[PDB]
């Protein structure tokens, strides 16, 4: 557990990465968010030289090769830019009785620190695809639903935050939808 094997550090880089692009982390990461090139891309250099990793080493061409270990992150294919992936704005309300009026589910989205739903439509799989204005609000709103949706007229309901990503991606992903 205490050697010179880089195998240990490899796993460590993850933590940094995973936290950097956290809802509260990025939104509060001027260094990254403020350095962001034109498409929210971060100059590969500004980051590749982050103190956290600066302790790791000074390998420019290598760092990005590891970053690929962050599925929720998208690094430039050329290895010169990169933008963090943090969307997920649509909320999915499942187990909603086909006889459940839009009125009932309408308030189940109701948020206390977020504005009213932007769009609420019935999507197959008894799952209602409600679209919020912004992820920061949606995701945060979902945190409130867990308390409200937890029950409806005494009817316990389950829901999951809908994340957006590549469609033609690999299905190898254990998690299914």
Range of the domain at 171: 86-177
- In the chain, the number of structural domains is 2
Q: Which two tokens stand for residue 52?
A: 């956290």
Q: What is the distance between the alpha carbons of residues 73 and 20, in angstroms, rounded to a whole number?
A: 10
List, as one string, the DSSP characters of 103-153.
HHHHHHH--SSSPPPSEEEEETTTEEEEE-S-HHHHHHHHHHHHHHTT-ST
Residues 61 and 28 in one domain: yes
Contact 126, 95 (CB under 8 A): yes
* Residue listed under structure tokens 């909320």: 91
Residues 5 and 70 in one domain: yes
Closest listed residue to residue 157, CA positions, set 120, 124, 123, 108: 108
- Among 67, 85, 103, where does a domain finish? 85
* Residue listed under structure tokens 């206390």: 112
Q: What is the distance between the alpha carbons of residues 138 and 124, in angstroms, rounded to a whole number?
A: 21
- Among 32, 62, 85, where does a domain finish? 85
Q: How many helices (H) and strands (E) does the chain have?
A: 8, 6
Q: What angle do CA 52, 28, 141 make, to 5 degrees?
A: 125
Coil, strand or helix at 161? strand
Residues 81 and 130 in one domain: no
């Amino acid at each position: 557990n205490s050697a010179v094997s880089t195998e240990d550090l490899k796993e460590c880089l993850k933590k940094q990465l995973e936290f950097c692009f956290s809802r509260e982390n990025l939104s509060k990461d001027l260094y990254l968010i403020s350095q962001m090139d034109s498409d929210q891309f971060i100059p590969i250099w500004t980051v590749a030289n982050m103190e956290e990793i600066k302790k790791l080493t000074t390998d420019p061409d290598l760092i990005l090769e590891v970053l690929r270990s962050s599925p929720m992150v998208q690094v430039d294919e050329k290895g010169e830019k990169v933008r963090p992936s943090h969307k997920r704005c649509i909320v999915i309300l499942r187990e909603i009785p086909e006889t459940t009026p839009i009125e009932e589910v309408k308030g189940l989205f109701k948020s206390e620190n977020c504005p009213k739903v932007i769009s609420c439509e019935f999507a197959h799989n008894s799952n209602w695809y409600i679209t919020f204005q912004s992820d920061t609000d949606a995701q945060q709103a979902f945190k409130y639903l867990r308390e409200e949706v937890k029950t409806f007229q005494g009817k316990p309901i389950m829901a999951r935050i809908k994340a957006i990503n590549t469609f033609f991606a690999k299905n190898g992903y254990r998690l299914m939808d």
